[PDB]
Amino acid sequence: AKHLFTSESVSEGHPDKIADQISDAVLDAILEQDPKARVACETYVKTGMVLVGGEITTSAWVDIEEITRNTVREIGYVHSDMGFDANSCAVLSAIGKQSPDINQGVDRADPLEQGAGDQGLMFGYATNETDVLMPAPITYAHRLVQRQAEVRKNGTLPWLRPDAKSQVTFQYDDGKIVGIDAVVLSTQHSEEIDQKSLQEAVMEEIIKPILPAEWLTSATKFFINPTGRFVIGGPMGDCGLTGRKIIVDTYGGMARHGGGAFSGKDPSKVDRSAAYAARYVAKNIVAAGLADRCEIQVSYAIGVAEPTSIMVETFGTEKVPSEQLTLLVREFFDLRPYGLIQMLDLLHPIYKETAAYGHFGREHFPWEKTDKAQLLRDAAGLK
Amino acid sequence: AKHLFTSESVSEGHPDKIADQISDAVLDAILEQDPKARVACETYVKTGMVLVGGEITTSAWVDIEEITRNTVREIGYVHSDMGFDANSCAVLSAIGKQSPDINQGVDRADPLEQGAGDQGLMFGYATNETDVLMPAPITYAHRLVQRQAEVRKNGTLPWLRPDAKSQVTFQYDDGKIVGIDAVVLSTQHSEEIDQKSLQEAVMEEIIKPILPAEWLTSATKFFINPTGRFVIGGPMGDCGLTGRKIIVDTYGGMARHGGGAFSGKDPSKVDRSAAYAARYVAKNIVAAGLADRCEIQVSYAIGVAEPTSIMVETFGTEKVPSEQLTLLVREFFDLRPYGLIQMLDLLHPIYKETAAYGHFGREHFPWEKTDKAQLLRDAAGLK
Amino acid sequence: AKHLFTSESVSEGHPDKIADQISDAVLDAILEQDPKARVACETYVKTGMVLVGGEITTSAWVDIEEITRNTVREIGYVHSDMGFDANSCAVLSAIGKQSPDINQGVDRADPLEQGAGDQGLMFGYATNETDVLMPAPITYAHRLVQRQAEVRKNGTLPWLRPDAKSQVTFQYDDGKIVGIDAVVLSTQHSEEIDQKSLQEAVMEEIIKPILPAEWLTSATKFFINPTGRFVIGGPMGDCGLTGRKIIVDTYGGMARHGGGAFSGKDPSKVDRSAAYAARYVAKNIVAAGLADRCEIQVSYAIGVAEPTSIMVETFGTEKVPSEQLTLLVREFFDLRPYGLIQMLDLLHPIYKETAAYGHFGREHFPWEKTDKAQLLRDAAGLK
Amino acid sequence: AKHLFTSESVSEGHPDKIADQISDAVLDAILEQDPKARVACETYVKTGMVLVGGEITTSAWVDIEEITRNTVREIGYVHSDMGFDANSCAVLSAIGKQSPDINQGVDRADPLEQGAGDQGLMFGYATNETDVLMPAPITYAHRLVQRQAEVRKNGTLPWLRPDAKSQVTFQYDDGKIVGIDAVVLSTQHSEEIDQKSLQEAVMEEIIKPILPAEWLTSATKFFINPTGRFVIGGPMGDCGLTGRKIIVDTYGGMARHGGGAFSGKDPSKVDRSAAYAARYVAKNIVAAGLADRCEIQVSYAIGVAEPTSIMVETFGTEKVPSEQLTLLVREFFDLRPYGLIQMLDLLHPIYKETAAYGHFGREHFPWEKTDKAQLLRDAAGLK
């Protein structure tokens, strides 16, 4: 039953994903020295200023002027003829520090893996459409621009200044992907490149090697780079702030995504840590037999680490009844907040990368390493 | 089978909304001198500062320093131990004024109606779930703390500083409406009101005579601020950020959401303007009997008028098989970008009411009026 | 009786003189549209931000983002490889606007050329050592860098990025300048120029044509460009704010300079307008006979446009007694504040230039046009 | 012959000083972890904001956000209708941390004592004009509103908000000391005190028992705030600015002043450090009988230890003909830059007391101690 869904992934580059980078990048050293830190990181960016604002609390003492500077080096904005160089661009910073004690915090927490957390409604999903478990669109969006960040940096094309937007559409007939409608990839590029050669370059080294031609029709629209030219890119003309690029980070479109800001929270801010657990259970369910597609919802108000809701659903997919799914899950991996810190050893430095390419997708994440998966087949049956 | 859900909200007090309000307020005040300006602003607010940074094209001159200022005025913030006073509140303009022809990022159509925007994805969702064709957990969340305001200006309960977060937690059975499981208010109270004291006048006056009394279980969990001492609130401690609470700005958690910029953009920018129109399509596709819970996707590509993908699920409940109506929409809801503009009488200041309390929700703004409805039933067949 | 005094003039370029430029440059259009405006203009500059802050009040409505941008074009900071380009450098702005009425102002003013002004102690001086009336050092400081801004811009040397510091020393034996000890001129320059050629270039096209060799010894030290190289210049590594480069603007060293911020005040701020009158009388006295060297002091508290003090002194120079000097002066050109606005027609746009090269010195200033000069000889005698 | 003078001052309340205070406070707090850091900061303050922007080299980590904050605390600003509260006051770091070797601008000597700085000019001036060898119009200005503070913390007159401008207006005859002509206080008063009411407790308690009563004419003009309603004061309306009140920071108006950076620089930067030392030379060259009103110039050139010009006028009154003592100084006051450092025991936090109320003025800081004095009299001849 015919559908053609779409998704956008923007690469590190597009100002919102810069922010995400500075944000967590203050967070990583402010964690590496003190993983018990509470930190958030609302970076604003545009034109000449990276404002790294927000509130911290660690033993650690992170330098911000270079953290900020440095990842703007890293993603590659270096002379003005692009649009803000890493190095004559002010970092200002308005980080409110409270002091590092334990007691009157924004909750109070006391036996360790009980009693805790804050307000937000975090969904999870994984599904079998893909080789690893993410909906087919955001994958062949994210991947696409991830070859863009391979094929600038290494020296393959010398010309793709890295603010790249990349959209993709899949002709959803049934359960499977029969077709894939239009690949929209715009990429910023030097004054060197006449468009016909970019129109050519993109399709060799960025697109064709990562779109599986077995789907690729003779209906499928290449829309590479459509508005004239792109030279000035990154904040030079536009404005960009922390992670309101929030769909692209977690199932581009397909995620019931219950209000939630991803990068730059330490892991006691539940909107993030708790929601990774919502992935860890969903995938862990899916590839292990118990259904063709799994989604969870988990939800907390402030305080009660006894979680206010577990809305598991499959949409006509399940192995046992919809109820026994829930049943198994609950007994198997507790999602009280300081609980999920523990399950997958979170506060040690895995962050710069969660900003930029896929917050879950690359098989090296604590939330992504499917493990207590094959331990689900056994209580369903041996499957 | 049965489910629980949750849907948060924040008042005109929560930093993120206060910011968002200001950005819509500059959008708005830019339109009063003319509507045809492209204009996006983004604020960041916290502590002692609001920076209204953005890129504006317009012949309007509006002095942002006033607009920021009496907007924070309209949120009640005066004697500073209420978080930040809107008299000392610093104000920084970083809005880049471009006049009506040399921008980076323009290029266009021939008649008005064939133009094209920048790219992305948008959805909208209806349901006679409750009154309006909102999925009324976000709505009973919202409505509940629509009353925090009513109170402040109406004198009656006096000590409420502006902030309100909230979660309604409904349980749901597979049809229409079962019972409340939990409901919470966090208002930031006066210094003067005793903790237990506050709870009750809340109970017997904010919460109940909003939140619809038929469903009241002997186990409806009632969290009036399990923290209590919400007092240094407002724009302190958590920072502002324009255009972040997108979910509670759009459809409980019940929304399939696109990445994106609801507040702070003129109705060219099809981030917002497609996803307003996708309630014009949704409410209507319910309102005329032909389903009972649509969600139509729209997407667009930059440098194209003809959109790239449009899909109206029907979570069951379709009173026409399917590709019939998805021609009907194609027949009389011109999804071409500038088309929408003219469809939704969108070029007017209208907008500062948006940032507040659902964009679609309230019966006023043209995005929920049942205009094109019986014109479908008699069209998809003649019934 | 031997002395060797020094002075520094920095060119437009050195961050403090940038500021001075942005400052008055907001002031000129905010005057051109409304000369009755009160405006001040504390621009901060460093690295990536020009902050143009301060308070205004006009009918006018000056754009600031381009004013700010534009004079950073003007003095020539254009690609990053210098240190902040005019155009990916944020201008932010925090200009506090009051509204344009007349009554409760920071004084109250009522018949026109009476009753008025504010607190400050403004000295004036002119003397005969120079062709026009300024002490010999600041002249052969200012002039020097003013050939630097001729010999970059025009295309003579293609290489002097314009943040130039220039110091000069005069062997003061008696009343006259018998000698001139050391010309210290550092100038910023491309990676093109090996120093020996700069060491050569400077002495042809910048120094020798403007130091009168008739003084120039074979003792006189050229100190051109001494710390290694200068490439990055202007705010790129240092920080710069409005007119605290305050000696160089008014008799580099030799001015009793009674506390006072020059650029970017409109002319009801007495520290500036009133003090120009302190020049208009001193020069007007000097070249017209009545003494070899004249200095005045004038001084006001807030309010009483009847000026609290007139400390005229010559230091053993006078034609009549020191007293009759005062006597003539008083009868001749009144220095109540709204008085001196009038004498020399000040509020019409002469400002961008008062920041940068000499606040008095170039023979086209209202304060500098000596006129009621020859009308002093007559009441002394016919001399 | 006779003269009038004037000398202003501002308290720890006037914006410019409040800023200056903070910048010296960061300088200071940077020295506590080590003295050898080059460090310059500059603040800008106003309304809701303090940005401590600057360039620091140091191994110290000091968190500016605290230092700015409890400094504005120490200026008394709390309940916001007193101008700006120092709890909501936003704080922005733009201090560029460089570690101990690759800077733009270093290059140096071989022993410590032959090093060189950046360039400029400095003067210092003594007189047993009144007690200390200050020209005590700035001093009776200063001293007078040194008492505004004494009062606030001592409880007695309570309603004084922190701001004080002031002008003493002395008349002078050609020798020692004649009569007061005028004296004014602008304090910013409470909302509560009646205008006439305030004047008198001012009169009979701030002004008199500072300002030395012998000289009290039947015509000493007494301006207690001819404006009266000074109330919205502090850092509002006129902006802050680090390092601007240089005259009232240095020598009435009676100072020959060099351009420059008294507050906010470590004692390398011979802006400040030469002009502290030129009171060590001045006070001393008076203190040992050999003149009664010196002013020695020093200057330096960048890339030279040996200074470029040094001159000790004697406005008459020289008890040694001249070039004799100007060898003596050359003999035992090593004016070579790092020399001074070691001469003036300058590498210590000392400094936040400086920004307040004369740099030289008070008998404590080594810049007014009569160390080398009788060691001259017996040296310039043996008397």
Swiss-Prot record, chains A, B, C, D:
Effect of H14N: Loss of activity
Modified residues (N6-acetyllysine): K2
Pathway: Amino-acid biosynthesis; S-adenosyl-L-methionine biosynthesis; S-adenosyl-L-methionine from L-methionine: step 1/1
Cofactors (names): Mg(2+); Mn(2+); Co(2+); K(+)
Stated consequence of mutating K269M: Decrease in activity
Protein localization: Cytoplasm
Presence of the UniProt keyword Acetylation in the record: yes
PROSITE patterns: ADOMET_SYNTHASE_1, ADOMET_SYNTHASE_2
Disulfide-linked positions: none
Effect of K265A: Loss of activity
Annotated effect of mutating D271 to N/A: Loss of activity
Family matches, as HAMAP family: S_AdoMet_synth1
Name used for this protein in its record: S-adenosylmethionine synthase
Gene source species: Escherichia coli (strain K12)
Underlying gene: metK
